[PDB]
Design a protein around this ligand. Structure first.
Ligand code: SF4
Ligand code: SF4
Ligand code: SF4
Ligand code: SF4
Lengths: 167, 171, 167, 171
């Protein structure tokens, strides 16, 4: 079930995907924009997001499984940041770009980022350096001084996080 | 959960024509209407496998479904031959039913040819179908497929066909 | 893990395989004859029996999983009955053929077969009708008057049992 | 648990030569000696996959092992390039190590040819190897495989190679 990756989402998902996992868990649904952003990200980690149905019910809960018709290429940071701004009721997008800075601050606080770390991230967001802000977030949650890569894809954030957590 | 392609070979070797066609249609179309989900899903249930229908995240002509199977270890009962033959005839969107009963003989002939049944076997099957001896035609199919002279049982259930097929294949 | 099929073994395994599952569970090992008889039977139901190792341990617990080099053709009743009589320390074979009738009676009692049912089975065993005794056992545990098949393979016993249990 | 063949394609696309060869040897031989289980198993660990070694029931030249992978969600650390290059040189039974460092140049040439690297690419790789520039040779391999002029990073870890490869493939 979807809840098997709650811990993983907090430890290794970038903020854009962490928020989608939380929303799906809390709302029991995501609109298409969110299903696409999060579903493709999961596909990039080797997981298929799907809704379980009952075959014996006539037409006329979300699950994850190892993957066993469509373009499964996961969205990059620039695709997320520059296109499809979320409307109310959407949970997709990049929080560094799309969240009100006051809300972003509160979100980072809930993520247990230090006040000093939050100040650095917000400074970067104000300069429109969204991916660099995200690198700073990465550095904070993994307790490393320098992430040592140039971030431009959510699946790269995940991949680099896994290297540290499984270090 | 596992992919449906995991039983492609099993279907050809041991599924009777009614279930063989449903597996094929599910694989090619990525979906079956309710009559087929019931007939095929409950047949799998009888073997001890649960079919699961799921909706893929990307769906907003591809209905966006993915099916999987797993070992089972609501109260619906797997269909007998008589239930399949005598009730729920398939409409145009449907792939269920019994091919010996429900397929036009010209199309049935073509299907048996695609299964590589001998001309002599096909002739015997079609003559049995002409007499409305559907289950006996299916026994002939069983015999042709397993290369035995006598299936050794009286066919009354797709799940019986499966068990008897596996018993031969298992020696 | 192996324990996931404890219930299945009691409900659908013929006595020859039920005893091997129990022995493997209790002894944490089976000699080769038992590993072969039981392992091939499981393969016939679409399961792979294997022992989990630790890759990081230098060389110089049993698991079951869906199957993903050797002949995997499962043993028939006659192969089991007529060959490889079990020595002490072996748990393979066919209990109708290989168990002392006093022990077979006790085993059937533990399986909750009625006294009348046990008498019928033992009569058949004395006549050397091992497979027919097994059919009678099948009829008793599934509460049917006539099994409606001619038994000659343990995997056929399982297949026919599944039809009833999932009926 | 899932079959190792599930990452055959992934290995060719995104595994550096050191891990690519270990995956191939594991698939063909159905086993690796300890140095290879460590190097490849820990590389997979770094990706977030746990390799499992198991002994098949039938084992009493086929050692009787079966390997599987699953998502990981003892304290051994995945090997860096320097660890692979400078320590634990492979003996004759071993498939571990760094091919740029450990393969005889004639055999390395043959291996790169089997990978369908251009003659020009192979020449450049071999010249780098001649200078003992193993990681820079591996960067050249990365560039040839992904059709980019500059890998854009300084290679120091097989798991870094993997992440950078996937980032390109993911756009
Ligand atoms: S910078 Fe990229 S990875 Fe980070 S939250 Fe934004 S879109 Fe996601
Ligand atoms: S005779 Fe019975 S088992 Fe054979 S195809 Fe028809 S319904 Fe299926
Ligand atoms: S008769 Fe056959 S299926 Fe029954 S216990 Fe003996 S060997 Fe097993
Ligand atoms: S240079 Fe590093 S990543 Fe490349 S093959 Fe050698 S050890 Fe592996």
């Amino acid at each position: 079930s979807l809840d098997q990756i709650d811990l993983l989402s907090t430890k290794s998902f970038p903020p854009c995907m962490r928020q989608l996992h939380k929303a799906l868990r809390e709302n029991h649904h995501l609109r298409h924009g969110g299903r696409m952003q999060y579903g493709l990200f999961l596909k990039g980690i080797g997981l298929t997001l799907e809704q379980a149905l009952q075959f014996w019910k006539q037409e006329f809960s979300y699950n994850i499984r190892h993957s066993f018709r469509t373009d499964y290429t996961p969205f990059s940071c620039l695709k997320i940041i520059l296109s499809n701004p979320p409307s109310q009721g959407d949970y997709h997008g990049c929080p560094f770009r799309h969240s009100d800075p006051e809300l972003l601050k509160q979100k980072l606080q809930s993520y247990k980022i230090s006040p000093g770390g939050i100040s650095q991230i917000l400074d970067l967001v104000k300069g429109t350096h969204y991916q660099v802000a995200c690198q700073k977030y990465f550095e904070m949650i993994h307790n490393v001084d320098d992430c040592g890569f140039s971030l431009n894809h959510p699946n790269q954030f995940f991949c680099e996080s896994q290297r540290i957590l499984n270090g």
